[PDB]
Each structure stands twice: as C-alpha cells, then as structure tokens.
Structure 1
Amino acid sequence: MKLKHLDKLLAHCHRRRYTAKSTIIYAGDRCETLFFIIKGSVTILIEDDDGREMIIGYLNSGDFFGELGLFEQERSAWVRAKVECEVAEISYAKFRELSQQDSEILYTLGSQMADRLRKTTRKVGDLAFLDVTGRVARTLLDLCQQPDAMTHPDGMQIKITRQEIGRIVGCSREMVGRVLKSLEEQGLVHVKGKTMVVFGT
C-alpha cells in the first residue's frame, strides 16, 4: 500500500477513538464495515460460553480488522482495544470500490490475512503439540516482538500480566504463575510487577 492509498481510505471513512479495553467488535454482530488502525493496538479474542477468553492475537497501526465478512456473515471474533485507538471505519461497499480503482489496497489486505493465517496455524500447532510451560515460553518470546516490547540491556522487557498470558496460552493465571516461578528459578526471565525481562532476546 502507498501513502496515496491511505489518503483515500482516510477520506472515505468514519473516524473513532476507542479507550483501552473498549470493545470495537462484538462476536456475532452482522458485518457491514471494516476497520483500519490509524494509531494504537487491538486484541482479538474468542471465548466459550463459560466466559473463558482466549487471545488469538494483536493487531497494530496500519492493520485492517473486521475484514472477514467482506468477501461474502457475522463477526467471527471479538476485537477489543488494547490501548487507546484512533480507528477508521470503512463500509464494505466503499472498500470494494477503492479496491477496484486501486488493486494494491486489496493486495495489502490479502497480505495481512496471509500473515494471520500463518500465525494462527502456528497457534494451532502450539495448542496441539506443546504443554503449558512450552506455550508460555513461546508466548513470552512472541510478546517480545510486539511494538510495545521495550528494549533492555540484558534483553527485552515487556508489560504483561499473568491473566493476559493465560488468555493467550489457554490456562488459568494460577498455572501461569507456576510456570513463571519455574522459569525464574531457572533464571530465564525475571518478573517484577507488571514488568518482565526476558534475557538474551
């Protein structure tokens, strides 16, 4: 996508700011538009009738979301604002148009979906083949690649909670605390508050 394409999209949308934790998309709702993250981050969640939530992933500035109902549908997952979000909502009708005039816009959307299919297919493998300790270790490493990951002399540090890790791997916060106690005893990470340093990464 080129700056000229962004310009157009931003010229044909409804802007919206979302405060952290606010729900942008409700699973089940009818799809009618798609979004583009101008600034900030969002969380993709799925959950069982039980209330247990699972974080499928995070999307950041420059990403599109709410695009799965385009080609056809009802919202396939929950999209919640991780941090304050400047978001641009664009109708499916207006999007298919801007895309016919400029194919690179669709190509970029296709690129993002492709990236997500890979990520999600790896998540399937994680849930299928790895134990919790394994998954937690994998999640923390992945989290060190997020844009909110901070740099550190001894590696990388991140702001994260046990609950968030549990949502990502699929286990209680209690078990996460246990895995961390072990990882720390092994000196693989060092936890301190909502902050955590992961050495050598």
Structure 2
Amino acid sequence: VETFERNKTIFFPGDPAERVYFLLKGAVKLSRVYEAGEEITVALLRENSVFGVLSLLTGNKSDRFYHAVAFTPVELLSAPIEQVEQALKENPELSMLMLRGLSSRILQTEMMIETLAHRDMGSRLVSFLLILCRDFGVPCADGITIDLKLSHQAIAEAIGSTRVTVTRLLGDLREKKMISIHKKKITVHKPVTLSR
C-alpha cells in the first residue's frame, strides 16, 4: 500500500507505462500538460478505481502522456503489468472484476463528456458539481458536501474555463444559495432539484 502526499505526482508524462494502479483512498487527478505548464484535467478519479490503463495496452514499451497527481492525500496499490498479467492469466475471476472496473471508468468519462458538452459555463459547472457530489459527496442537513478541497483554479482546469469565470459563477451560485463554500469544501444544497 503506497501513500502520496497531497499534490505529489504518481506518474509524469514521459514515464514508461510500467504499472497498473488501484485507488484505495483519496482522489487522483489525470491531466494533459502543456509546454508552459498549463494543465487540463481529464479525470478526477474516485476511490476504488483502476487507472494507469495505458500499460494494459502497450505495457512499459510505451510512455505516459497524461500526468497523474494525488489530488488529496492518496493511498493506492500498483503492480508491474506482467505481475498483473500473471495474476489474471492465473485467477480468472479477478479479470471479470477488472472488466467491470474498466467498464465503470468508461461510463464515468462519458458523464464528463456530458458535462463538457453544455454550451453555457453555468450548467457546465453545476453538472460537474453534481458528479462530484456523487463521487465524493458526504450527506448533510443542507444537502451534500463535496469532501474535496476545490480551488477555483482546480475547477477551471476541469470544466474548460478561466478562473475568473469560475469565481464569478461560484459567487452567483452562493448569492442564489444553491451552494455554500467553506475552506474550499463545497456544499450543494438541493442536488436532486438541480438535476433539472
């Protein structure tokens, strides 16, 4: 069981795709990185996700092109591909469960496609927040607290927007009392009604 301090890198673009990973605790951010250091978020992975799947294809013969970061303190398992490939070719059942895990990854990414497809950033934001509710939400008298520290920057990198825009949108959502924010934990007040 490995641990990663918050903001520690799990793999860098350019690193051989040596291992597969399983996320026990915390959130992992996958992103694409650009020459100047800008990053675009491509996935925010929730507990119990398999990831690093490019090694399931090319194994260490190929290089990472996304950046994997411990978005919160993380705990995870990982194993070179042949170790995995052995464990599978050996334990048939296990594979049925990784097939399920991968199927989940795909359905989750497609939900982000849906979030990103909205033309107006306001809905893009609510929709992204509703997903986080589901992935990391904690029940509350108000509604649901997204148990992650979310900077305006981090949100911008994930819904395709600038930070200034996120700030304005977030302020608008509070003015209207659909959300509260405290030390970066966002609480969504009426999740179910927001899925309108």
TM-score by length of 1: 0.81
1:181 lines up with 2:171 in the alignment: yes
Answer yes or no: is 1:151 the counterpart of 2:139: yes
Greater per-residue helix proportion: 2
Q: What's the RMSD between the two structures over aligned residues? A: 2.1
- Give 2:194's aligned residue: none
Kept in 1, the 8 Å contact 2:28–2:70? The answer is yes
Measured against aligned partners, the alpha-carbon deviations of 1:40-87 in whole angstroms (never above 9, x if no partner) come to: 332212233343222222224432221222233222421111222232
The gaps in structure 2 that reach 5 residues or longer are 192-196
Query: Percent sequence identity over matched residues?
Result: 24
Paired with 1:139 and 1:127, the residues of 2 have a C-alpha distance of: 8
Q: Secondary structure at the match of 2:53?
A: coil
* Deviates further, 66-75 or 20-29: 66-75
Aligned residues of 1:68 and 1:76 also touching (Cα < 8 A): no
Query: Aligned equivalents of 1:119 and 1:169: distance in 2?
Result: 15
Q: Give the AA of the match of 2:89.
A: Q
Structure 1 residues 30 and 162, CA, compared in 2 at 3 Å: closer, same or farther?
Answer: same
Q: What does 1:102-113 align with in structure 2 at a 5 Å threshold?
A: 102-113=91-102
Distance 1:62 1:181, change over 3 A: closer
What is the distance in 2 between the residues matched to 1:126 and 1:89? 30
Q: Alpha-carbon deviation of 1:193?
A: 3.5
Equivalenced residue count is 186
CA deviation map 1:90-120 (0-9, x unaligned): 1111111110111222222222222222222
- Call closer, same or farther: CA 1:51–1:131 in 2, change over 3 Å: farther
For residue 189 of structure 1, what is the amino acid of its counterpart?
A: I
Q: Residues 167 and 100 of structure 1: is their aligned pair in 2 closer, same or farther, counting only changes over 3 Å?
A: same
What aligned pairs does 1:51-200 form with structure 2 within 5 A after superposition? 51-72=37-58, 73-147=62-136, 149-158=137-146, 159-200=149-190
